[model samples]
Target: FPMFKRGRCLCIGPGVKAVKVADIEKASIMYPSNNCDKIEVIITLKENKGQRCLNPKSKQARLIIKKVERKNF
Candidate 1:
């Protein structure tokens, strides 16, 4: 099977780890869609490791989402 099987989401549980902004290379939010039924905050680390899930309800995640959304240029 692929890393993430089709008709499934990448995150299946609540995200409890709180990562610092400086360690984050990229942050993006995934809203509910036809394939996934929940909102997810995904991030890439400066270390170039695998991506991680963030608690969308957390302050840091929300801030990151806002910053990601504000990007235009």
Candidate 2:
């Protein structure tokens, strides 16, 4: 439906942890170990695997975040 187009998917949880690429970039300034320019986001999964890093620069990543935001808010 139209809602699906707006934002619906097996999505990320709604939390303040969700942030923009610029936010990550700014954070990287404090932690040199982080490479926000290359990595999109580090989603902390409680599973044994620990986390999932996505590419914020990618269209898919941007779309997913947009969808999640619309759904939650």
Candidate 3:
């Protein structure tokens, strides 16, 4: 992986909830890791709904992740 940046939670204050994404009942930016190379994304698996670390920049990780553009308002 290259030039990958892990996302930091923007809604980390309080009362934050998980979002619905495909089989992912909830998704969020667990925390911001080091610079690019390999982003560590925590995702709830589809099968058993268990939490796991995945890379949104990877192909296999795409199975659980769906890319979306920033909705500027």
Candidate 4:
């Protein structure tokens, strides 16, 4: 996986807890012209746990790429 520069702050949708690279793989491939800006990544608090908001201070979240597109036009 490559590390892309963060661009914007995306909102996390409901029922989404953790994020994984595999989750966003499809989107990335689909949109090759789009750069990976800030993603609305999903983060799971606990291991194997369902989607839920974990402690704000906790750092157990992962980035699940959903929609990949350019930052600015």
**Candidate maximizing lDDT:** 1
Candidate 2 local lDDT, 1-73, one digit each (tens):
4555322222243233434433221111112125223334434322222333433233244444543343221
lDDT of 1 at 29: 57
| lDDT string, candidate 1, 5-26, tens digits | 4545444333334344445434
In candidate 4, position 31 carries an lDDT of: 19
Residue 25's lDDT within candidate 1 is 31
**Per-residue lDDT over 1-73 for candidate 4, one digit per residue giving the tens place of the 0 to 100 score:** 8765343232233344333433322122221123444232333323333333322344233222232232312
Q: Model 3, residue 16: what's the lDDT?
A: 20
The TM-score that candidate 1 achieves is 0.41
* Model 1 misplaced regions, further than 4 Å: 1-23, 32-35, 56-59, 66-73
Assess each prediction's global lDDT (C-alpha) against the native.
Answer: 0.51, 0.33, 0.41, 0.31
Please say which candidate is ahead in lDDT: 2 or 4: 2
lDDT of 3 by residue, 1-73 (tens): 5955345422122222244454442334434545434445555544546554544434233443342121211
Q: What is the number of backbone collisions in each predicted candidate, taken in the order shown?
A: 0, 1, 0, 6
TM-score of each: 0.41, 0.27, 0.30, 0.17
Clashes of 3: 0
* TM-score of model 3 vs. true structure: 0.30
Q: For all the candidates, what are their Cα RMSDs to the real structure?
A: 6.3, 13.8, 11.6, 13.9
